[model samples]
Target chain A: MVKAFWSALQIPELRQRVLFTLLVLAAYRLGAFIPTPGVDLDKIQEFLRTAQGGVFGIINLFSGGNFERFSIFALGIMPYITAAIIMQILVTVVPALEKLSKEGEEGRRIINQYTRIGGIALGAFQGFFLATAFLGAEGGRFLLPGWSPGPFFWFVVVVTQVAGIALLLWMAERITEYGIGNGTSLIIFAGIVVEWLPQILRTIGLIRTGEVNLVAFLFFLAFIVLAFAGMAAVQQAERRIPVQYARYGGQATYIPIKLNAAGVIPIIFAAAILQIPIFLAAPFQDNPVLQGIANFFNPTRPSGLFIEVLLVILFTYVYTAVQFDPKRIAESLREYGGFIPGIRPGEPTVKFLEHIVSRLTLWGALFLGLVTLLPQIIQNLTGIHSIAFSGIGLLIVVGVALDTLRQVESQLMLR
Target chain B: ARAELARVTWPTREQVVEGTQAILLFTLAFMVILGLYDTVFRFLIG
Candidate 1:
């Protein structure tokens, strides 16, 4: 492993990419620690600690605790991610977008431009909400001392947050352009992985102090290893359907269909959908109905487990449809003179594609559902709250690692 | 002689609408079922 690491570092381009990636990540982490002005840091930290089981907790996990501290990168890359997804879905349904997508590079550039605009719009919206709910209050600390921000404050906050998000998005894009890996995913993965390190260390300390047994620590380690392996398998696992390339001398080919084509997207979408109810009930957090709803969707609750399972299944299907369009795939394949050995090349091909995808999607959805529910199930059974990392985080880590490795491998083979 | 127009087999506007509706319906049905499941689990836990 050390030799491999040294070899990787010896490659000039890979070394530079690694260094640049590290620098960007360091900058992100530094920004997370730079507190937003005016709020009582202690109070906010206390509130976050108490609010860990709620939406804020999940958001903090994704943002790498930036949200808890209301850092410059508080919104993190979420707005950009959401915008990208929206654009992806729009391209599928909108004719203009569909045309643009088919137009290749120029089309993709246009779509990316739209995503940046959408990212800014989302950032502004989220900033406005954040300011009103947490920053603009009499006791709010977002504004610096002696700086009474009126309407101007709101403008400043919105622009600053939007700019911050845009900068992060740009950084990720730069990494993708000149560095290694899927930049945006890697950044998010870095955030999640870094946040867990301190907790893991603390758990080890507990075992050393006799607060927790060595067996328990060992079990946790084993479980984590198993979960990591499972997630890796799921992400790379796919269904290969045989195809005949009639145009290419009737040669045999195969279409690789991802078992979990949507990856962590469905989980993110489900979390976003669940947040609607939370937002609706934000003002009435103390109300019984609202509290009941909150508890039901609370990440630590049993209700949350079932809801997560259901949402995983639903979003898997929805996003799978968005990611893979059987009609278009079939049309393209047919135009290229490719077909399933016995099936006719047009509508029949589309139907066949859909049928296989649907069955595979079911298995993919179940895998996701299990992954999402497993951590919660373990926590419940073991009565150990320390096992709190979500399954989606593991999926992101493994997926990003695999993708990065594949890129590295390609670069290695290039020379 | 006028040039012959190529025939295209496009799904009608109505068909498109119906297809979109089906997806939306499925989404709603899933949400409601899940919401109910959540409620039941919450009640049990309480």
Candidate 2:
């Protein structure tokens, strides 16, 4: 296994992809360093010092700490994700858009086109809001102290942010086309993983200070390890639907459907939408309803937990239903003269597959809900608020790593 | 749910151990690499 790791690197194409991914990741980290124009560096730093544990923390988390610095990539790829969600909602509600989506690659391409346009528009909107927050109505705390704001400042800062996000979108595209794994996901992976060192050190400090006893610390680690193992186990588990070819008298095979067919997507979907209300309510703190909205939607709150779990289950079903097309699979199976051993072909096969999938998804989705709940559980038991990465963050990291490894292996084998 | 889950093929102990270790290893690798890379950029840009 160790030798295969090195041998995979020896394959030039695989090596190139590895390097390409790293370089793109390097570029992303570099963007985190460069600040947006007309911002007071120290002012932004001071604001973050006070804001680190709240919604800003989550925003900074998503933006790879770019939001804290008020960097050009301050919005990160979140606007793009939000735009995709908008497109997804539209596709569900709008018949023509839904039809376009079902047209496969060509349809997906057009949808992507619309998503980009909408993404940039969303970026500009976010950029404008963020700029206002920085320069505020009165204090003007985060911007350069002496520089008074005008239309020119707004245009430059907003355009700069839009350009940064556009550049990142392009970079993520390159990583997807030429590098390994999903580029957009990897960029977020980079964001979370980049903070691992500081988060670890903070935990260690807590242990040293006896803020968390050694027993609790050990329990935390064990919980994380067990959760990691469980995630891998569930991800690898599959339900085999045995199939037999009519032409072949003895040989038989089966379609292996994963236990968690939706993978990390449901968690990503859940987290993404869950944060929207918290963020939107930020600028409206004076209003009672918005204040309540923000408080209730917080990830650590009981109300938030209920909504999060519900979103996970609902998205799990939606994604699983869309991703696993029993009708198409059944038709293709019949076309190839193959059928599930006892099941008849055509509609019967489709129904059988659907029944199994829907049932499988229930367990799979519940498992994901527990996994998402694990970090919060650990945090409550251990009293470690310093831990930066969430259960879903770790999930994304491990999931992406596993996928990248598999893709590397497939590339190495090439047959 | 129980019936369907029981029918599912769970990963063997070995696969789970390997996957957990591999993921942990990659996570550490990313931390060290990106941390150092960020340090370099900070020095250059700051």
Query: What Cα-based lDDT does every candidate model obtain?
Result: 0.64, 0.75
- Among residues 3 or more apart in sequence or in different chains, the pairs in candidate 1 whose N, CA or C atoms overlap within 3 Å are A37-A141, A38-A141, A39-A141
lDDT of 1 at B31: 31
Q: What is the lDDT of residue A35 in candidate 1?
A: 61
Deviation in Å, model 2, residue A175 alpha carbon = 0.8
Please state the Cα-based DockQ of model 1 relative to the true two-chain complex.
0.01
TM-scores for candidates 1 onward, in order: 0.77, 0.90
- The sequence of per-residue lDDT tens digits that candidate 1 reaches over residues A303-372 is 7657766887788766665564689888887576878888888899888888777766677677767777
- Model 1 regions more than 4 Å off: A1-9, A51-54, A92-94, A138-156, A243-253, A262-295, A318-351, A386-388, A410-415, B1-46
lDDT of 2 at A324: 45
